[PDB]
Amino acid sequence: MGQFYSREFDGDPYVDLMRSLPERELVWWAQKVIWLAEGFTFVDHFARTYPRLLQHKCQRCKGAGVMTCPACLGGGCRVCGTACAWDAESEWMERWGEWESRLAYYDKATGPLMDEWYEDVLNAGNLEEDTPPVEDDPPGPEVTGRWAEHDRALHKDKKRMAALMRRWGHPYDADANLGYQIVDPTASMGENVWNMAQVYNSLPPELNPLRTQHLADRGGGNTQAAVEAARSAFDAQVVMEAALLQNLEAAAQDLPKPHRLPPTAGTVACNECGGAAWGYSFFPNTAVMFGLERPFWGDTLARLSKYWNPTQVADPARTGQLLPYGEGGLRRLLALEAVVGKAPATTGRYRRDLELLLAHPELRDGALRVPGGWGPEGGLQTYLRGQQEEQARMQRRRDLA
Amino acid sequence: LTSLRGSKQFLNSLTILFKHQKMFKKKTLKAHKWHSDTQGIFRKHEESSLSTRLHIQKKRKAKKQRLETRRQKKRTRFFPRPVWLRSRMFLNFLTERNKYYLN
Amino acid sequence: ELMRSAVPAPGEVPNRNSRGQVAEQVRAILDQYKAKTEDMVDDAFTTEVVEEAMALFGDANSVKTAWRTQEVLRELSYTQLWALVGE
Amino acid sequence: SEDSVEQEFGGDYSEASLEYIRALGPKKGAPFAEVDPAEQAAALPPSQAECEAAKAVLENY
Amino acid sequence: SAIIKSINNKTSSEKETMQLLLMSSSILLHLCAIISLVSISQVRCFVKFHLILLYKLSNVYNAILNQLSNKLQKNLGFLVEWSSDFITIIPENVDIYIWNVFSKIYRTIPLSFISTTLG
Amino acid sequence: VVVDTGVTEDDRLRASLLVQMLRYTVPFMVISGLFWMIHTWILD
Amino acid sequence: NNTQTNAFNQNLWWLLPSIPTASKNQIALIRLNWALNKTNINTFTDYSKRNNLWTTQKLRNQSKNNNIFSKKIISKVKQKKQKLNYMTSYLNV
Amino acid sequence: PRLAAVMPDAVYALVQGTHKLGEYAHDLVFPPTPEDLRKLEQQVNATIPREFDRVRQRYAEGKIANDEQLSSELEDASFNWYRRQLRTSVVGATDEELEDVAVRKLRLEPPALQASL
Amino acid sequence: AIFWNKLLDRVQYKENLPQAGLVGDMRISYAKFLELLKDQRVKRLVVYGDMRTAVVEVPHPWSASVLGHPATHPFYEDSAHNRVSMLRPNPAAPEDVTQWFCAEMPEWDMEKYRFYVDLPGDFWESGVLQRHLAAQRAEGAVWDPASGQYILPYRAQKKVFQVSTEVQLLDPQESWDFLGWLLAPGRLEFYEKAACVAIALRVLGIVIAIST
Ligand SMILES: [Zn+2]
Ligand SMILES: [Zn+2]
């Protein structure tokens, strides 16, 4: 835009020519910015590629950073790590329930239908009704049949819809789901974040402090403390997921993993290194530069085949040892495992439930959808208790008259 | 006592909804070979109302296929939303969010 | 049933859609937009709404933790190779 | 007995919709930005029983 | 250490030769990489842009802080450069300063090398 | 089963040297070619 | 949005509304990114085929309101089989 | 514009053009069959579903279209085949009840080996 | 597609890391993973490029067998809409339901946790995976000459809640990191805007040049 006019561009055979044509000036500016983009690309490629030459790995663990505790491979071992948060198998569906509840809020898979339902209940003034359907009528009561019960339950839907709408309004107003139009995937992630971080929309209600900032009293002192102590665990789990995914991305290629986590319930830390499994060294790691990193399958085959097949060159003829190696050999040498075989001992906690699933075949129909779980406080036993207690309750209600 | 338990009143099986409201093609039935014998083990060994629904479906789509309708197009949703579908979706979202308490 | 493969086929693996994919489907179907009687094939139900009945309660959209089933299941693993060879 | 849902609805529906509605959550709570009864129940201090009982232990003191 | 241990262990004054060879190879590799990088035209554009930015920002900082400094003593455009070649805007005393500092830093390499190797 | 094996190129650090040079030098050519295409093959 | 590619973008993150402050700020930003990912909207783009197969009806309608036979009918059943696959349990596609 | 749309079209065009050039390379060296073109004629005819044969006869006897009436005729054939396949997916085929659907999607039955030979 | 669908997951390999069955700190321990492995609860093991990290896939207990539990989605139903179950009461060890026999469910119908695990640096030369593979693959059909017939023994069938393990190793060379970095969305949008302005200025320059 005629920026080469002011005073101080005289003396350049090409700039004075650019003075006479604005298009040359504008394409000069475009090229000037594109060359800088190219330079930035060159440099950042170099800077993310060169560090891979200087990375060396501890040779005893092979970059794992962690070795095995054989005492556990066959009240327990006390050398090898602290059990992780998910080793408790009897806590699985509970944690999954909490997490899927928290995930139900953020979800926008059914965004459009929820939106137009909110737009239908919102005004209720449009009413561009088309032509109503030829309406069926259900087979009347006193006809006990599964098809008939299906039909009667199908015809009892609008009044129940209004009833639940009374009990639980549109989720867009109870803010149980993410807001009306906070995000749609066709704007800019730049805009979509700003809308997300406006007012604590990055959390569900149950952890939001705006819901609780009004009441905190002498009674418990937990209403504003035991929700901050839950927000904290929430953010910790989110950060752990981010870290584990960075490690998975570094292991999808053959790179060394960036996050060195502590050992676990079957492994001890490598003694040679600190548990740090690798590092940068200023010496170029010739094996990566010359592409000799991985060990040629046949070599590993030979190694493992000669490690799993030890040899006994001495014979018990001269040497007075007729027993194999080990301890307590004299005591070492003192039902239906050959047919069905072993009984699996990891799943007794479901035995009871299965028995119930055999005592009540009707629970196997597609109309019932139990939440799930194992214990008496979860899943099938909840429905059984509800059914039995309600039938007894209202049968005793029949006893009043 | 009203808590997370679920019940048979929510029709959580799409084949029932389809064979009761949308699918009226009747089949030529024959002998089977796999069936649930005693002990409830799958081993190897109403029609007139749905006919009425069949006929009314044929009439309705015959009417809206020759361009006789308030709107205009063999195929378009007419915003007379079957509340049966809107209902299920609400029940599902509600139980999924209400799973909060089962601890 | 003795000479069946136990490795099903590259084909008979039906599709299963993740959450993002059911969202894509729900969008692309929500904004998707003489003869006489007894000429019909008796499948004259409304095409649009049964599609949403499918998308929200269909089998190919019913496992909430399906990541990419067709790809990772239409490849053969090491054990499936060892089993093919043995036949 | 005679708790909430059969007071508001009650004769609003048959006994079938009673169970039908009863199986979808206690009332409406933290998942819905509300303040649950059990969590609010701690936000109330003790009653006058506290008052004159502690006054009596004060007199004994 | 594992590096130096390996080249000491596997291959009459031979280990010192191997170690000198390793250190020279590594330094030369890094220097060759850097020179080959800045031998690309667009990377020269990149470094020129960063230099003019840092010059202007240092000028701002200098003005501000020197002015507040002699105040405490009282107590007690861009395009003209960005579109012109590099050497016509920079003086020569600057590069002479760079060269003098370099020379003064490394002028004791021969004596140190000789003393190190010879007992 | 008919098993087939490659030629396995015994040298290993003479079989790999030139291909590694290419692995290191070609990205620069790809970046330069892409940017050259956009910034000269259009606004000549 | 104009600093999406470089690292300088990082300094922008600290400018919107037992351990120190920068820690909890970073963790809030991380939670923001995870939450934005969790909304299941990432895959929808204007140029998919899953979006082009159900939008050919409307575009055909408005455009008409604006060995060949085998080719046509087989193209029809090909697009229909594609919709069968992307819809529910189809068996070979 | 929108490279995300250009790249798939680019590769599709590449491979389809290569297929065309290969077909040309095969029709000149090995000239086309004179009568087995009827073999392929009928064997691409046989897999046309029944819901399309209604226009095939309408394609034989004159009253096909001008060019536009068929292009709205076979549309409803496509659509009824579509809904029929949907019903075969969900409620099964014409000679197949829910037990047999559970049999088929559980992969319970083996392919008949005795009947094979 | 047969070509494109492949090539696309080479360039876009970071989008295909599992994001569905992994939620928070979803690690298990090496002993917990070993225990789950020995008793046949792991459906799919996915060993990664460096061979020092794995993603265990474990079905939800009710989605493992074909029991008609009312927590599995009603995939398979009778005419009278009752889900099917495939129990067999173990004539050798009755009175204990957990030792009964039942068919396993198709892998594309399981709900699955996807746990993370770091393997030790001596996992391959200890032979745990080899022991498991050999134990599970060394049993099959038989011919019984006493009763003259083919026979699938009981020790070759799956009890309740047990599945068959599928080990799958990934290829490090199937990653293509350079192109995934080169064609990133931000670089894509920059390329597009630059090309737009380029074609604009070319046609505008020729417009003003024919206008002379
Ligand atoms: Zn141990
Ligand atoms: Zn180590």
Q: Where are the beta strands (DSSP E) in A69-154?
A: none
> What is the sign, positive or negative, of the torsion defined by CA atoms of A198, A203, A206, A208?
negative
Q: Measured between CA atoms, how close is C63 to chain B, in angstroms?
A: 14
Q: Which residue of B has its CA nearest to C55?
A: B14
How many Å from the N-terminal Cα to the C-terminal Cα in chain C? 13
> What is the sign, positive or negative, of the torsion defined by CA atoms of I196, I202, I203, I208?
positive
**Determination technique used:** cryo-EM
Alpha helix ranges (H) inside A170-227: 189-196
Residue listed under structure tokens 């496509």: H78
Please name which ligand lies nearest the alpha carbon of A76.
Answer: 1
> What is the sign, positive or negative, of the torsion defined by CA atoms of A173, A176, A179, A185?
negative
The answer to whether the CB of I187 falls within 8 A of the CB of H4 is: no
Helix, coil or strand: residue G90: coil
User: Residue E22 corresponds to which tokens in the numbers above?
Assistant: 């390793």
* CA-based R_g, chain A, Å: 35
Alpha helix ranges (H) inside chain I: 4-11, 30-38, 128-137, 177-182, 185-210
Q: What are phi and psi of E31, to 5 degrees?
A: -65, -40
Q: How far is the CA of E2 from the centre of ligand 2 (A)?
A: 12
Helix, coil or strand: residue A220: coil
- A290 interfaces chain E, CB cutoff of 8 Å: no
How many Å from the N-terminal Cα to the C-terminal Cα in chain G? 40
User: Residue A173 corresponds to which tokens in the numbers above?
Assistant: 């107003």
Q: How far is CA I88 from CA B45, H33, H104, I96, in A?
A: 16, 60, 21, 12
Q: How far apart are CA H11 and CA D18, in angstroms?
A: 60
Instruction: Please give the DSSP secondary-structure letter assigned to residue A7.
Output: S
How many Å from the N-terminal Cα to the C-terminal Cα in chain F? 59
Query: In one letter, which amino acid is I73?
Result: H
The number of residues in chain A equals 401
Rounded to the nearest 5 degrees, what angle is found at the Cα of I160, between the Cα atoms of C77 and A371? 95
Residues from chain H that touch I196, judged by Cβ atoms under 8 A, are 1
Beta-bridged to residue B35, according to DSSP, are B43
Mutate to test the interface with D, among A206, A384, A385 (most CBs of D within 10 A): A206
Q: Measured between CA atoms, how close is F39 to chain A, in angstroms?
A: 7
Alpha helix ranges (H) inside I2-120: 4-11, 30-38
Helix, coil or strand: residue I144: strand
User: Residue A155 corresponds to which tokens in the numbers above?
Assistant: 């015809």
Q: Where are the beta strands (DSSP E) in B39-86?
A: 41-44
Helix, coil or strand: residue G73: helix
Report strand pairing: I166-169 vs I44-47: parallel
Q: Which of A30, A35, A38 sits opposite F43 (nearest CB)?
A: A30
Q: Is I40 exposed, middle or buried (0-12, 13-18, 19+ CB in 10 A)?
A: buried
Touching chains, G (3+ CB pairs < 8 A): A, C, H, I
Mutate to test the interface with A, among B1, B8, B10 (most CBs of A within 10 A): B8
Instruction: Please give the DSSP secondary-structure letter assigned to residue C42.
Output: S
- B7 interfaces chain I, CB cutoff of 8 Å: no
Q: Nearest-CA neighbor of D21 among B98, C25, A13, A90?
A: B98
The answer to whether the CB of A36 falls within 8 A of the CB of E49 is: yes
Residue listed under structure tokens 């039995």: A388
Element (H, E) at G29: helix G21-37
Please name which ligand lies nearest the alpha carbon of A272.
Answer: 2
Residue A84, annotated ligand binder? no
Query: In one letter, which amino acid is B101?
Result: Y
Residue A61, annotated ligand binder? yes
Say yes or no for a CB contact (<8 Å) between A371 and B6: yes
**Per-state percent for chain C, helix, strand, coil, to nearest 5:** 45, 0, 55
Residues from chain B that touch H105, judged by Cβ atoms under 8 A, are none
Q: How far apart are CA F44 and CA D19, in angstroms?
A: 77
The answer to whether the CB of A109 falls within 8 A of the CB of C22 is: yes
Q: How far apart are CA G23 and CA G14, in angstroms?
A: 11
Residues from chain A that touch F27, judged by Cβ atoms under 8 A, are 45, 49
The answer to whether the CB of A237 falls within 8 A of the CB of I18 is: no
Say yes or no for a CB contact (<8 Å) between H95 and B35: no
> What is the sign, positive or negative, of the torsion defined by CA atoms of D56, D58, D59, D61?
positive
Say yes or no for a CB contact (<8 Å) between I169 and C78: yes
Q: How far is the CA of E15 from the centre of ligand 2 (A)?
A: 27
Say yes or no for a CB contact (<8 Å) between H87 and B25: yes
Q: Nearest-CA neighbor of I178 among I14, I19, I6?
A: I14
Q: How far apart are CA A112 and CA A168, in angstroms?
A: 20
Chains F and H touch (3+ CB pairs under 8 A): no
Residues from chain I that touch G4, judged by Cβ atoms under 8 A, are 185-186, 189
Q: Nearest-CA neighbor of I51 among I167, I166, I134, I170?
A: I170
Q: How far is CA C2 from CA B44, C76, I90, in A?
A: 17, 21, 22
User: Residue A193 corresponds to which tokens in the numbers above?
Assistant: 């974040």
Q: How far apart are CA G47 and CA H23, in angstroms?
A: 30
Report strand pairing: A267-269 vs I44-47: unpaired
The answer to whether the CB of B14 falls within 8 A of the CB of C58 is: yes
Residues 6+ apart with CB under 8 A from C14: C59, C60, G89, G90, G91, H105, I108
Q: Measured between CA atoms, how close is D3 to chain B, in angstroms?
A: 9
Q: How far apart are CA A378 and CA A358, in angstroms?
A: 18
Instruction: Please give the DSSP secondary-structure letter assigned to residue H112.
Output: P
Q: Is A374 exposed, middle or buried (0-12, 13-18, 19+ CB in 10 A)?
A: buried
User: Residue I90 corresponds to which tokens in the numbers above?
Assistant: 């173990």
Say yes or no for a CB contact (<8 Å) between E33 and A50: yes
Q: How far apart are CA E118 and CA E114, in angstroms?
A: 6
Query: In one letter, which amino acid is A332?
Result: R
Rounded to the nearest 5 degrees, what angle is found at the Cα of A175, between the Cα atoms of A169 and A178? 125
Resolution at which this structure was determined, Å: 2.8
Q: How far apart are CA B44 and CA B33, in angstroms?
A: 6
Q: What are phi and psi of I151, to 5 degrees?
A: -150, 130
Q: What are phi and psi of C75, to 5 degrees?
A: -95, 155
- I78 interfaces chain B, CB cutoff of 8 Å: yes
Q: Which residue of C has its CA nearest to B82?
A: C49
Q: How far is the CA of A60 from the centre of ligand 2 (A)?
A: 5
Q: Which residues 13-42 on chain F approach chain I with CB closer than 8 angstroms?
A: 27, 30-31, 34, 38-39, 42
Mutate to test the interface with F, among I176, I191, I192, I204 (most CBs of F within 10 A): I191
Q: Which residues 19-38 on chain G approach chain I with CB closer than 8 angstroms?
A: 37
Q: Nearest-CA neighbor of B6 among A383, I71, D26, A93?
A: A383
Alpha helix ranges (H) inside chain C: 19-30, 47-57, 69-74, 78-85
Residues 6+ apart with CB under 8 A from A79: A69, A71, A268
Q: How far is the CA of A76 from the centre of ligand 1 (A)?
A: 8
The answer to whether the CB of I13 falls within 8 A of the CB of I176 is: yes
Question: Half-sphere exposure of residue I12, counting CA atoms within 13 Å on the CB side?
Answer: 11
Q: Nearest-CA neighbor of H83 among C14, G57, B53, C48?
A: C48
Instruction: Please give the DSSP secondary-structure letter assigned to residue I166.
Output: E
Q: What are phi and psi of H43, to 5 degrees?
A: -85, -10
Q: How far apart are CA E9 and CA E17, in angstroms?
A: 13
Residue A80, annotated ligand binder? yes
Q: Which residue of D has its CA nearest to B98?
A: D25
Ion ligand 1 neighbours, Cβ < 5 Å: A 69, 71-72, 77, 80
Q: How far apart are CA G40 and CA G36, in angstroms?
A: 9
SS3 of A353-364: HHHHHHHCHHHH
Q: How far apart are CA B58 and CA I171, in angstroms?
A: 56
Residues 6+ apart with CB under 8 A from A119: none
Q: What angle do helix axes I30-38 and I128-137 make, rounded to 10 degrees?
A: 10
Q: Nearest-CA neighbor of E26 among A284, A53, A54, A286?
A: A284
Residues 6+ apart with CB under 8 A from A92: A86, I113
User: Residue A269 corresponds to which tokens in the numbers above?
Assistant: 């830390």
Q: How far is CA G63 from CA C70, G58, G59, G77, in A?
A: 36, 8, 6, 21
Alpha helix ranges (H) inside A228-319: 228-252, 286-289, 297-307
